[PDB]
Amino acid sequence: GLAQEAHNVRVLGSGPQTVVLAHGFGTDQSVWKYLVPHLVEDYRVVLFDIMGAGTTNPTYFNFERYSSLEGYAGDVIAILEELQISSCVYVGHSVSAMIGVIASVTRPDLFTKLVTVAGSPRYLNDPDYFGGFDLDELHELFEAMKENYKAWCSGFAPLCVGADMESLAVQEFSRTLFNMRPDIALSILQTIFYSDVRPLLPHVTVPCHIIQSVKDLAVPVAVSEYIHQSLGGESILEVMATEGHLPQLSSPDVVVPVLLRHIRYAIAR
Ligand SMILES: [Mg+2]
Ligand SMILES: [Mg+2]
Ligand code: NA
Prior knowledge:
Layout: H1 2-6, E1 10-13, E2 18-22, E3 44-48, H2 69-82, E4 88-93, H3 95-106, E5 111-117, H4 135-147, H5 149-161, H6 168-178, H7 182-193, E6 208-215, H8 221-230, E7 235-243, H9 247-250, H10 252-264
Parallel strand pairs: 2-3, 2-4, 4-5, 5-6, 6-7
Antiparallel strand pairs: 1-3
Helix pairs in contact: 2-3, 4-5, 4-7, 5-6
The structure holds magnesium ion (2 copies) and sodium ion.
GO molecular function: hydrolase activity; metal ion binding
Keywords: Hydrolase, Metal-binding
Domain AB hydrolase-1: 18-251
């Protein structure tokens, strides 16, 4: 299939229950490597890479399509229809959280449940909302990406994963970051940091399970609280006693059980 080839779609497990695992910026579907073995016995598991990941063809990259998160939401829908999947649980890491939120407002029929890991509808600050970042901070971040991409990746990965340089996850993430073509990495990260999905949250109807590390460089806990307060369907908040923006990769011993519970169980009342 077209989307299956372009997004490295892999379908594992078995059964009528389907779980889609969608990774965030700088990594790929390997971010789920410790969760997948605990799902395949009970679920059909759909893995894919978002366009622009270092595992995808950079000559392909459609800069206009991916200048807005709507392009990534369209990709999710196209993958499910190409796979003829009419219903799934969608687990979205970082940017893939809001991508699933957007896809669920366009096509609520495709999702029985959203599970977000370190999602945020807005990273910039305004007088009534603290996203965590201001404009000149972002400017200097983007200039570092342009000036020395390898040095940027090497400094960014430990801060993002929230661990020392020699952490396994830091080293994995350093490598997947540096496999992105620098102009594509910059374009995607600008699309992410300048997004605003806040107006869409009240229009969500799919129940959402909102997960993050208590200490996440990219997501203040107050943002997760804001998501819970703004969503138009049922939702539950579970802040984890972990540090890091890729907690399913760096702290799987405790984060995999959290994800399993929220994939498996419905919100009470
Ligand atoms: Mg991201
Ligand atoms: Mg206001
Ligand atoms: Na639904």
